[PDB]
mmCIF file of C-alpha atoms in Angstrom:
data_model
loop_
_atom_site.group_PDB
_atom_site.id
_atom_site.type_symbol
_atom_site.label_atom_id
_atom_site.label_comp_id
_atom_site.label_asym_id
_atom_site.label_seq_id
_atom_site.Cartn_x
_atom_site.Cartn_y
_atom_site.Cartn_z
ATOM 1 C CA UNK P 1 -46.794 -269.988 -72.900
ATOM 2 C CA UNK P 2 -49.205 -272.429 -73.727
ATOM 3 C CA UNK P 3 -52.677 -272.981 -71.282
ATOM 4 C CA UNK P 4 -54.268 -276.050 -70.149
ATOM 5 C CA UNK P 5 -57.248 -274.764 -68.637
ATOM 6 C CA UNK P 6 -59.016 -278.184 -68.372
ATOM 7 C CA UNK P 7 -59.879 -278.589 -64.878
ATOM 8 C CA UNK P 8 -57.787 -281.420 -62.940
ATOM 9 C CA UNK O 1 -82.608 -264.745 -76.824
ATOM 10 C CA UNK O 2 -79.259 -264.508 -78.414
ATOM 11 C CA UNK O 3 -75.712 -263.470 -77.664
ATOM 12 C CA UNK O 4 -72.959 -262.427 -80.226
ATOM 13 C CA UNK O 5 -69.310 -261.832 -78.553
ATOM 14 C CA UNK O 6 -65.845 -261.220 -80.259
ATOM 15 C CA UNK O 7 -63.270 -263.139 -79.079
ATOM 16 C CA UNK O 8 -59.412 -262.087 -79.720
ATOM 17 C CA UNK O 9 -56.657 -263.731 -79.240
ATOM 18 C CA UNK O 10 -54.161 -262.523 -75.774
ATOM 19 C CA UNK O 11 -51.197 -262.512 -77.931
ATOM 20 C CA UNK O 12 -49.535 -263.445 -81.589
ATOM 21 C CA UNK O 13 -48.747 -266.827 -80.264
ATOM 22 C CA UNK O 14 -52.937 -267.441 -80.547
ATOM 23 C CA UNK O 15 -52.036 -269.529 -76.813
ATOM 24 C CA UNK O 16 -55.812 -268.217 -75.483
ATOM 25 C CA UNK O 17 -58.605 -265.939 -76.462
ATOM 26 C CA UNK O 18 -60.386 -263.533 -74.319
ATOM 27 C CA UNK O 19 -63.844 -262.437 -74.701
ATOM 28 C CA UNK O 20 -65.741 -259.460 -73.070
ATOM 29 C CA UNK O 21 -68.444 -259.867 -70.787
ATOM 30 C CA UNK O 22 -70.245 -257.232 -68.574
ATOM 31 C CA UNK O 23 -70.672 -257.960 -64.790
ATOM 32 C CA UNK O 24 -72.873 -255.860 -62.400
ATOM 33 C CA UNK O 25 -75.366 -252.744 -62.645
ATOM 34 C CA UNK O 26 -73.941 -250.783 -63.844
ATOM 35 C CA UNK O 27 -72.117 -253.047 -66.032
ATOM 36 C CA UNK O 28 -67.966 -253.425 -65.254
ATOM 37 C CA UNK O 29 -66.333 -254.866 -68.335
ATOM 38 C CA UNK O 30 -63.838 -257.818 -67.533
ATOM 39 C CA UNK O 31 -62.349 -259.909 -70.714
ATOM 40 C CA UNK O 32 -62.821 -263.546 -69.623
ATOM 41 C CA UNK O 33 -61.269 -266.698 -70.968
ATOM 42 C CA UNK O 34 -64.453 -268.843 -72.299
ATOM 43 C CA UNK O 35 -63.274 -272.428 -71.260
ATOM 44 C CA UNK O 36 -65.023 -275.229 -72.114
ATOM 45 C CA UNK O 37 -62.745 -277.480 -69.863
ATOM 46 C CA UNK O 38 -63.978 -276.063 -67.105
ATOM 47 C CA UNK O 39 -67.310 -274.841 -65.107
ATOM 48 C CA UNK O 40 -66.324 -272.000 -62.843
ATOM 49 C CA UNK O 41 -66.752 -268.086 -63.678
ATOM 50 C CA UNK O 42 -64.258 -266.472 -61.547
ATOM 51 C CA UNK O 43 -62.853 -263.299 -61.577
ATOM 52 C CA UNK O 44 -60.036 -261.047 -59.724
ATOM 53 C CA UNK O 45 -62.284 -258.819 -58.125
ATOM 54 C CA UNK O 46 -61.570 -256.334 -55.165
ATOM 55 C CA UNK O 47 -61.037 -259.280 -52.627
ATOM 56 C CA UNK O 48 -57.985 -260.435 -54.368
ATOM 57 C CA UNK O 49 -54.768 -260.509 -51.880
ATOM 58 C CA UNK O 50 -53.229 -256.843 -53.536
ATOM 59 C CA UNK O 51 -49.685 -258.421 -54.191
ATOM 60 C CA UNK O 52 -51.124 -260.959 -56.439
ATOM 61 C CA UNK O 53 -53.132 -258.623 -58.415
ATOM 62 C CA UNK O 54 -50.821 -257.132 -61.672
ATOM 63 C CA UNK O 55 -52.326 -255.531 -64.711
ATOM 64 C CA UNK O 56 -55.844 -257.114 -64.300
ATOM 65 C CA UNK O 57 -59.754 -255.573 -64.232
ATOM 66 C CA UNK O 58 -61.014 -256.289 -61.281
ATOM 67 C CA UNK O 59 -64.397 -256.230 -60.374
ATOM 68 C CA UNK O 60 -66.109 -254.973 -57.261
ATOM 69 C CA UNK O 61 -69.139 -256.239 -55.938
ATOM 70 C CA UNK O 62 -69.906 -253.150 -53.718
ATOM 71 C CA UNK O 63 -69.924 -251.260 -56.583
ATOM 72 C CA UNK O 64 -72.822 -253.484 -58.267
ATOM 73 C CA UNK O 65 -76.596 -252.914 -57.084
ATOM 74 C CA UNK O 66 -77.625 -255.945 -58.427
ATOM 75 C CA UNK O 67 -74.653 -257.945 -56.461
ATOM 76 C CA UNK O 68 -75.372 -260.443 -53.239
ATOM 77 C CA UNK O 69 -73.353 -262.048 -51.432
ATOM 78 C CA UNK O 70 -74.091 -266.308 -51.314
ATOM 79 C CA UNK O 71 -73.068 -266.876 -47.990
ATOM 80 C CA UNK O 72 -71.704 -270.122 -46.462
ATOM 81 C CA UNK O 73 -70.510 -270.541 -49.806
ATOM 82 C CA UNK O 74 -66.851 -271.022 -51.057
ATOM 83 C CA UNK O 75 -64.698 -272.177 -54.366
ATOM 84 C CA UNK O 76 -61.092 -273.706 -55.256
ATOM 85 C CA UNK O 77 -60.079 -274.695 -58.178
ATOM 86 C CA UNK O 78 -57.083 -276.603 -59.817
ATOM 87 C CA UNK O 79 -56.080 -276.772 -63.276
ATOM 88 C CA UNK O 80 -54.515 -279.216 -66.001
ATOM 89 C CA UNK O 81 -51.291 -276.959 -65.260
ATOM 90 C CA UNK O 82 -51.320 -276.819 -61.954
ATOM 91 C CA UNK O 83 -52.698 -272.997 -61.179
ATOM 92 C CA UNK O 84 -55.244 -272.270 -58.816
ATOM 93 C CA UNK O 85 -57.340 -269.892 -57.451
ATOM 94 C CA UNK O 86 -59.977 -269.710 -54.408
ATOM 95 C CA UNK O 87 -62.784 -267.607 -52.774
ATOM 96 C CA UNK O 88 -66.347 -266.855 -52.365
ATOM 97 C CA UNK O 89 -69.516 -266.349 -54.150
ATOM 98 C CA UNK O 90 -71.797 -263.793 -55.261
ATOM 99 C CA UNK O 91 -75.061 -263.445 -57.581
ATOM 100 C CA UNK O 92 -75.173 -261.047 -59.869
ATOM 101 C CA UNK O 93 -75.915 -259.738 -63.548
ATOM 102 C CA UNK O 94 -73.897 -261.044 -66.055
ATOM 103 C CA UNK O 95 -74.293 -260.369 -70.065
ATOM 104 C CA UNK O 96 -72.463 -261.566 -72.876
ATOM 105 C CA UNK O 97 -72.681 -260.477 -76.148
ATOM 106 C CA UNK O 98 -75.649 -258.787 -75.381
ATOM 107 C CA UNK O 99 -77.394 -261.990 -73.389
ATOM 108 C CA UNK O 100 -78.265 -261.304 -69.946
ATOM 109 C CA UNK O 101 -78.471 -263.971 -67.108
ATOM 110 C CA UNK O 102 -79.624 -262.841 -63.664
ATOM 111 C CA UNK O 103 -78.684 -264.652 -60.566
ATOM 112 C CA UNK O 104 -75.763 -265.863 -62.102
ATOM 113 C CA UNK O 105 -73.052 -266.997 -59.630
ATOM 114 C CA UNK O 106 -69.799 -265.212 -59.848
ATOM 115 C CA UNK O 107 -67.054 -266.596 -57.703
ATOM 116 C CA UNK O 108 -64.886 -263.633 -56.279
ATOM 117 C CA UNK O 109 -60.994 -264.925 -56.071
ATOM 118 C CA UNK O 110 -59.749 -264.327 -52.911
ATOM 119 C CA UNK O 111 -56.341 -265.491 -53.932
ATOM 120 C CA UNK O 112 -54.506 -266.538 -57.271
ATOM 121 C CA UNK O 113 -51.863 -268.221 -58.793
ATOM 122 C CA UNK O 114 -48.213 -267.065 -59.987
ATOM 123 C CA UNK O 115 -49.653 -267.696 -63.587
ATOM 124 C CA UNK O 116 -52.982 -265.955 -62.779
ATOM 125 C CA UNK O 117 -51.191 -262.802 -61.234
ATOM 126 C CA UNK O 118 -48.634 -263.298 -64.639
ATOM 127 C CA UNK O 119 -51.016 -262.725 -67.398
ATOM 128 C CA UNK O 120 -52.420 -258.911 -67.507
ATOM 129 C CA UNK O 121 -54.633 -259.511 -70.464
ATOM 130 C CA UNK O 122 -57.383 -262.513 -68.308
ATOM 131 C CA UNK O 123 -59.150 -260.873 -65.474
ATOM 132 C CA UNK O 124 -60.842 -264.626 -65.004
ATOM 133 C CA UNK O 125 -62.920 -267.744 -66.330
ATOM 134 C CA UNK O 126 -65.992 -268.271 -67.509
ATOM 135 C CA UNK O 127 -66.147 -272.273 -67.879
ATOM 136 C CA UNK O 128 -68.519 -273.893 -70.594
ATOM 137 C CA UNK O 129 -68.229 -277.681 -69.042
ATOM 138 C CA UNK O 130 -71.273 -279.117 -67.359
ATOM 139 C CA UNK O 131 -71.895 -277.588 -64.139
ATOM 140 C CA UNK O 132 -71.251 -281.460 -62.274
ATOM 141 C CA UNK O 133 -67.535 -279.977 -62.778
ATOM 142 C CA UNK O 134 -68.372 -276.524 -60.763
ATOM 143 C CA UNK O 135 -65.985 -275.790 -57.292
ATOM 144 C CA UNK O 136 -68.775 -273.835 -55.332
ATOM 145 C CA UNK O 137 -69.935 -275.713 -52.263
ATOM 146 C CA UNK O 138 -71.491 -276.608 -50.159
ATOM 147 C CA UNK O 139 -74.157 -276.567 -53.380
ATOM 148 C CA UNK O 140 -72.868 -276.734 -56.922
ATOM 149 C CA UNK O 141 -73.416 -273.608 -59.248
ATOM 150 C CA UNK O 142 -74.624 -273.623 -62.695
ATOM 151 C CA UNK O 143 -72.545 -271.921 -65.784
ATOM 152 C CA UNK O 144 -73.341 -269.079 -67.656
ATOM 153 C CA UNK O 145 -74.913 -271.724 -70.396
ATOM 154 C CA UNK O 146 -77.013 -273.383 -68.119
ATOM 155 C CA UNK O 147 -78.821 -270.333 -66.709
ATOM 156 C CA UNK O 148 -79.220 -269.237 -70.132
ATOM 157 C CA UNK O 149 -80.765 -271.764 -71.620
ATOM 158 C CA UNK O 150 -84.094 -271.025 -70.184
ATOM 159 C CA UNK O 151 -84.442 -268.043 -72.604
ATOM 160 C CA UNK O 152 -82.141 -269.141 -75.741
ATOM 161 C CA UNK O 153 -83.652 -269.175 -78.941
ATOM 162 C CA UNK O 154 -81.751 -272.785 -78.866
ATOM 163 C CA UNK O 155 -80.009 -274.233 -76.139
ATOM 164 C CA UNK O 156 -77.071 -274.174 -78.205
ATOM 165 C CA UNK O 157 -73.621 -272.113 -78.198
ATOM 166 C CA UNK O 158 -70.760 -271.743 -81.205
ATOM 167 C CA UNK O 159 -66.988 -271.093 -80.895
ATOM 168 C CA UNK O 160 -65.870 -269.769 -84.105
ATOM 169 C CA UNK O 161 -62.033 -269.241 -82.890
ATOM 170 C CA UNK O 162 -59.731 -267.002 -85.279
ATOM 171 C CA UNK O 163 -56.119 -268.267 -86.333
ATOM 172 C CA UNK O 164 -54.051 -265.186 -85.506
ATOM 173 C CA UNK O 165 -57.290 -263.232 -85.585
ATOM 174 C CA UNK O 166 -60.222 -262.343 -84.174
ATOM 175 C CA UNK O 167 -63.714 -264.572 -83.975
ATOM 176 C CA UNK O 168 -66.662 -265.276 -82.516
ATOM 177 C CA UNK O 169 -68.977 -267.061 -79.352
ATOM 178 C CA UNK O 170 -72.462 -266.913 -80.334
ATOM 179 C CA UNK O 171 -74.718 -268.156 -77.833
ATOM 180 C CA UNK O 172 -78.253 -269.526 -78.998
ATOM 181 C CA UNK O 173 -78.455 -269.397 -82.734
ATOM 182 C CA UNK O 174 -75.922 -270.942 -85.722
ATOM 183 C CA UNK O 175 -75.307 -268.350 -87.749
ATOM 184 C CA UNK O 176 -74.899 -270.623 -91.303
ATOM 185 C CA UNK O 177 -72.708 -268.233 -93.129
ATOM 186 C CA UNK O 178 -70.038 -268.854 -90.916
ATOM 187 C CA UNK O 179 -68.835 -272.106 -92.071
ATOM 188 C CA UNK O 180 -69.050 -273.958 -95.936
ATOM 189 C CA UNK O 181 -70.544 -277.694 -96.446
ATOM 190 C CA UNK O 182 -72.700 -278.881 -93.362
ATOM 191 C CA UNK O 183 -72.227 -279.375 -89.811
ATOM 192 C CA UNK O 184 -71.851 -283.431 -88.683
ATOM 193 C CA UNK O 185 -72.566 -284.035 -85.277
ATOM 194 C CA UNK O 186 -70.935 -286.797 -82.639
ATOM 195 C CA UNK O 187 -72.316 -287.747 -79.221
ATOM 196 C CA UNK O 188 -70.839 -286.070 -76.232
ATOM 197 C CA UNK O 189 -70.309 -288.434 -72.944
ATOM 198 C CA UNK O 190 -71.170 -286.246 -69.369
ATOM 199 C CA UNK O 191 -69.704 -288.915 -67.616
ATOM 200 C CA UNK O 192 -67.027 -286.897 -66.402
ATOM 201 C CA UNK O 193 -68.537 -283.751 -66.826
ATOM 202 C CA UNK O 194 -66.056 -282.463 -70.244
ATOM 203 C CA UNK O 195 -67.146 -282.061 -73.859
ATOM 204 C CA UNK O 196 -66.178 -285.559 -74.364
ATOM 205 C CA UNK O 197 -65.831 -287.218 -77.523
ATOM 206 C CA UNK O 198 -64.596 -289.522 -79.813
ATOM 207 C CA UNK O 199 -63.009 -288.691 -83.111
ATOM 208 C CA UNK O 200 -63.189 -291.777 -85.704
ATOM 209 C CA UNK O 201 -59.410 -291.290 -87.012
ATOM 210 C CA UNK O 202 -56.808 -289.814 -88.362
ATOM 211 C CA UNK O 203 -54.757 -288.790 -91.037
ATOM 212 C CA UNK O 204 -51.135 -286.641 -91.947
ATOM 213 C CA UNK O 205 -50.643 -285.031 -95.149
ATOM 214 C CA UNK O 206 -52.437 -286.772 -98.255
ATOM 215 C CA UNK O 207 -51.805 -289.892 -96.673
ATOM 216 C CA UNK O 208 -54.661 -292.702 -95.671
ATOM 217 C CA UNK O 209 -57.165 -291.981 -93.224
ATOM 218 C CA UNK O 210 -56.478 -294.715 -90.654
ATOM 219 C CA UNK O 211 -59.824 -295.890 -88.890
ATOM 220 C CA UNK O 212 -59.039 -295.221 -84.555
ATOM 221 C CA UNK O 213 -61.376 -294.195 -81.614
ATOM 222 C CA UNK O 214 -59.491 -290.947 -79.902
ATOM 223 C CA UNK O 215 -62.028 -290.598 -77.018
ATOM 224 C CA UNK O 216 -61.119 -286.746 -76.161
ATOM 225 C CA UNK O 217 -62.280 -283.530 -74.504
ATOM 226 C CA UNK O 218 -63.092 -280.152 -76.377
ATOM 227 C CA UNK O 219 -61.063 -277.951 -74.604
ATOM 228 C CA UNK O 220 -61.365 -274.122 -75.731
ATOM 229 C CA UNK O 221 -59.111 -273.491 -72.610
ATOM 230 C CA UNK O 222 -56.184 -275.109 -74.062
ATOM 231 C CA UNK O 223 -53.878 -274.020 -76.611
ATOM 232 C CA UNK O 224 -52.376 -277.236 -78.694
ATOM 233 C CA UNK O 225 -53.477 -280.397 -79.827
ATOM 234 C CA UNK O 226 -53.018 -283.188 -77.129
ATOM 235 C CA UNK O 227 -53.129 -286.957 -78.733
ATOM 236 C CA UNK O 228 -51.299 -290.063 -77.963
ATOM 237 C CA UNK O 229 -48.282 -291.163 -78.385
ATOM 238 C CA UNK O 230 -48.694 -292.774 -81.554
ATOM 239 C CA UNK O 231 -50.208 -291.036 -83.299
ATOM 240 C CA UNK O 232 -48.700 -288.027 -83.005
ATOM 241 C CA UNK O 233 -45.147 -289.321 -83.505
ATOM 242 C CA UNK O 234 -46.955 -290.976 -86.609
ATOM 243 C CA UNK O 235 -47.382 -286.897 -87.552
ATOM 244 C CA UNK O 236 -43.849 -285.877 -86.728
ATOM 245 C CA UNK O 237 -42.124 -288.727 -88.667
ATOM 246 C CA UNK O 238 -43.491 -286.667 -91.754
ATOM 247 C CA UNK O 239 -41.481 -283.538 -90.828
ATOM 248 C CA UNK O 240 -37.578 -284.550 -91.315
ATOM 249 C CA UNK O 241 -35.896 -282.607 -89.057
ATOM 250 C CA UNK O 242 -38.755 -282.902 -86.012
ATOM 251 C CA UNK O 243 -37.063 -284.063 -83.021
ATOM 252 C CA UNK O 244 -38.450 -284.731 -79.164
ATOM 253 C CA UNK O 245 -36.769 -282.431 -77.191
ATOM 254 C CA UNK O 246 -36.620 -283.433 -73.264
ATOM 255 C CA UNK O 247 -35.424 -279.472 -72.543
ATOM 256 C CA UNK O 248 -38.179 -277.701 -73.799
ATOM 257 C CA UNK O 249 -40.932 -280.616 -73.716
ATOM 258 C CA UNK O 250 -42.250 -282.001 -76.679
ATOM 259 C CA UNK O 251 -41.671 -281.919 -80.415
ATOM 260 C CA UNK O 252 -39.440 -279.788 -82.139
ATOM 261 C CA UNK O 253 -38.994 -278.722 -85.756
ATOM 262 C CA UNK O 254 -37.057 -276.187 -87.885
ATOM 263 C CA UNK O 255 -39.395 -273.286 -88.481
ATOM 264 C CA UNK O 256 -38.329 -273.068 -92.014
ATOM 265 C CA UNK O 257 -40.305 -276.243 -92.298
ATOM 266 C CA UNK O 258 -43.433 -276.563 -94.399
ATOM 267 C CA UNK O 259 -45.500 -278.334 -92.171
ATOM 268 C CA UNK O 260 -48.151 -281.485 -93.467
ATOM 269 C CA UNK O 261 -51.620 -281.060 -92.859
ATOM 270 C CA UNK O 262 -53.501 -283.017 -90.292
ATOM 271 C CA UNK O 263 -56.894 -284.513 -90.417
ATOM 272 C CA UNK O 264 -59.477 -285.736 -88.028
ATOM 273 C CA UNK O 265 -62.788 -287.761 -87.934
ATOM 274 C CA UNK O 266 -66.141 -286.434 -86.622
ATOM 275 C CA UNK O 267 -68.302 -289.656 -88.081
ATOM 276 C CA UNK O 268 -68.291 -290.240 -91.760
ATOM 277 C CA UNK O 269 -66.999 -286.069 -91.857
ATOM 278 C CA UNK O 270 -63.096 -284.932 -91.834
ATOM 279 C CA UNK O 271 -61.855 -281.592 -90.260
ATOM 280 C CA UNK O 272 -58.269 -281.354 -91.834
ATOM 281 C CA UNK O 273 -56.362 -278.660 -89.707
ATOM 282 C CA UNK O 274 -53.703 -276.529 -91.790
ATOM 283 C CA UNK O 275 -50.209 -277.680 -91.465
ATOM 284 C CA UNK O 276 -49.335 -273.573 -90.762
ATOM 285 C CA UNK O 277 -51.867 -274.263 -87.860
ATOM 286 C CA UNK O 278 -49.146 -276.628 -86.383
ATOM 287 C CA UNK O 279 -46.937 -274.454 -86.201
ATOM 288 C CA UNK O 280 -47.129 -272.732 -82.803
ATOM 289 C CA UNK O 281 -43.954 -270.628 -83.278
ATOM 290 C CA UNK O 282 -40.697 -270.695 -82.367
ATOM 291 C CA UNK O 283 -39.335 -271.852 -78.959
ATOM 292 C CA UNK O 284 -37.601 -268.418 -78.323
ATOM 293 C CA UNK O 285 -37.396 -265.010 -80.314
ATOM 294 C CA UNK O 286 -35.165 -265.352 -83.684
ATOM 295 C CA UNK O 287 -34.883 -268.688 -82.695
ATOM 296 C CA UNK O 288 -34.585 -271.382 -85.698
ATOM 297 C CA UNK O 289 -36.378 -273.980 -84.198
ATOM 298 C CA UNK O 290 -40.018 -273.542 -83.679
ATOM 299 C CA UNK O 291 -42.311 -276.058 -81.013
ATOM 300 C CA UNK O 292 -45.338 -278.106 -82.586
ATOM 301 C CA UNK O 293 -48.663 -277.808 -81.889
ATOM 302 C CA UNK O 294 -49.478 -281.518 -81.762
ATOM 303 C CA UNK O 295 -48.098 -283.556 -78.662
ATOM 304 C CA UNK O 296 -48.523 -286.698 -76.699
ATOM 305 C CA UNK O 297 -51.662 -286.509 -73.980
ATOM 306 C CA UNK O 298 -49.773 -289.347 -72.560
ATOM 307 C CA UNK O 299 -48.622 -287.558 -69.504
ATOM 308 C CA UNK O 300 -52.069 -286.072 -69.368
ATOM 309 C CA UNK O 301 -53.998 -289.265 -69.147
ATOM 310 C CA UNK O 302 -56.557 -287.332 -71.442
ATOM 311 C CA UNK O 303 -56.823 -285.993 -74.927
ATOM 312 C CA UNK O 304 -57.427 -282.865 -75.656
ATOM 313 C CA UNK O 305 -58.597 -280.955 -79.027
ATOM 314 C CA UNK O 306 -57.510 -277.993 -77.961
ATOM 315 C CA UNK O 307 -57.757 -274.332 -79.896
ATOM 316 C CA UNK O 308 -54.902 -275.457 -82.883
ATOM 317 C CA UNK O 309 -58.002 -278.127 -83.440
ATOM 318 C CA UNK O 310 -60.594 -275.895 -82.543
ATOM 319 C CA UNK O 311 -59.793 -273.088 -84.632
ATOM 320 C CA UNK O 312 -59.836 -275.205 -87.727
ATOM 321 C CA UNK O 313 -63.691 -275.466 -87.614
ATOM 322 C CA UNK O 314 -67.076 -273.680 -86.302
ATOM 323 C CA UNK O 315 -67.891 -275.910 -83.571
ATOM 324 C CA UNK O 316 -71.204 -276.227 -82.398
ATOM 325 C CA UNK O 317 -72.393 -277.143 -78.357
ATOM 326 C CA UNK O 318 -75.817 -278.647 -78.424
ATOM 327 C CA UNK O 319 -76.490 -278.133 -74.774
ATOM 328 C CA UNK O 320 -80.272 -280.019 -75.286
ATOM 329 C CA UNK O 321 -80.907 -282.403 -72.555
ATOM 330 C CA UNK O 322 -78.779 -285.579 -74.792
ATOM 331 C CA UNK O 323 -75.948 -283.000 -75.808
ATOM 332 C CA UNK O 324 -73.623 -283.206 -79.037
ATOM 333 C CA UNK O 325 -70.730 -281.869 -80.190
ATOM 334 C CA UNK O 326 -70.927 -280.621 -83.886
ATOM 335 C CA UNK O 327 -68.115 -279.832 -86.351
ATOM 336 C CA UNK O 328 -68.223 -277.605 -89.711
ATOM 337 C CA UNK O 329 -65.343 -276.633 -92.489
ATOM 338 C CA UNK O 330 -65.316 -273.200 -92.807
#
């Protein structure tokens, strides 16, 4: 589903 | 020098967009995720461990005359999410949108994550952040952007992203039929190395704009709109009906609803985002209820103007030596 292609 | 790409959206949901980009002499194809919350280009290549390799491009740097190796040198990288990926570096070719950069470092996954090896339609990265953010040691390697600035018309790059449709990266130029009015720009803070910003306020519907520093990142690598608690359950108290829902993480609503419009502030400007933009769609096929695309960045610890922000507006990346962040209607 949806991405959270920040980098952490 | 300029570069024009298209850049479509993986699926109907709009959750990323992939753009092509050519890699090697000759040239092998690969559609990358542009990702301007991150610094790294990797890509699944012919080192990848086979099992975690699916439906991807790879590419193959034995294959590529132009390819060398950068030896000593290695890359691992985490994600807001959680996936990963690791493995070493070459130089090589790369052109977008008809832009080339030489010597441009392209990290070669060794290995991937369960999401990575999931999604058939990204064959890798190519991150937009500054390159203080980049994996590669023992030396740091610069992005796509940097290399390119030497020869850019302007050091300068546009996202253009499509709701439920295709759009555009241009790299170098503003092309000034692509948005109405005029673009405002805002100061962008390096400090820790994102696209980072702060928006002046915010308003719901045809209500008042109320006057608020949201320091956030602009994060083309994330799908939904990530703002705190407040103010987002300041949005949902205008859709009756929206509910937080523990099970599948975050507000709710029925998709029948008619959602309100939501507005932000770059300086004195206002972007106002579509209410049908919210609406990210439903939770499960034929399902009633639908999930929103604005949430809390409270468990975060970060906001993030992600693509249902993004896509609401050309946004401009003034990559000169004080950068800015620049936001247009369109």
């Amino acid at each position: 589903x949806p991405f959270h292609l920040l980098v952490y | 020098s300029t570069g024009s790409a298209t850049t479509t959206p993986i699926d109907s949901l709009d959750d990323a967009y992939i753009t092509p980009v050519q890699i090697g002499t000759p040239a092998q194809t690969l559609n990358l995720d542009f990702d301007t919350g991150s610094s790294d280009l990797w890509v699944f290549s012919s080192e990848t461990t086979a099992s975690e390799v699916d439906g991807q491009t790879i590419y193959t740097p034995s294959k590529s005359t132009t390819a060398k190796l950068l030896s000593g040198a290695t890359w691992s990288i985490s994600y807001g999410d959680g996936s990963s990926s690791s493995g070493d570096v070459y130089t090589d070719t790369v052109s977008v949108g008809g832009l080339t950069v030489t010597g441009q470092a392209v990290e070669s996954a060794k290995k991937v994550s369960s999401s990575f090896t999931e999604d058939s339609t990204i064959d890798g990265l190519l991150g937009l952040a500054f390159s203080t953010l980049n994996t590669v040691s023992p030396t740091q390697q610069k992005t796509f952007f940097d290399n390119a600035k030497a020869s850019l018309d302007s050091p300068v790059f546009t996202a253009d992203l499509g709701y439920h449709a295709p759009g555009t990266y241009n790299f170098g130029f503003i092309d000034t039929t692509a948005y109405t009015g005029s673009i405002t720009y805002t100061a962008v803070s390096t400090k820790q190395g994102f696209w980072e910003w702060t928006s002046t306020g915010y308003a719901v519907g045809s209500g008042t704009f109320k006057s608020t520093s949201i320091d956030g990142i602009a994060d083309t690598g994330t799908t939904l709109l990530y703002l705190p608690a407040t103010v987002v359950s300041a949005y949902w108290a205008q859709v009756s009906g929206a509910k937080s829902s523990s099970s599948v993480g975050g507000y709710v609503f029925p998709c029948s609803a008619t959602l309100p419009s939501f507005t932000f502030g770059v300086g004195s400007a206002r972007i106002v985002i579509p209410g049908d933009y919210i609406d990210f769609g439903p939770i499960s096929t034929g399902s009633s209820s639908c999930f929103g695309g604005i949430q809390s960045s409270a468990g975060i610890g970060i906001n993030i103007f992600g693509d249902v922000a993004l896509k609401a507006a050309f946004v401009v990346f003034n990559g000169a030596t004080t950068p800015t962040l620049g936001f247009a209607s369109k």
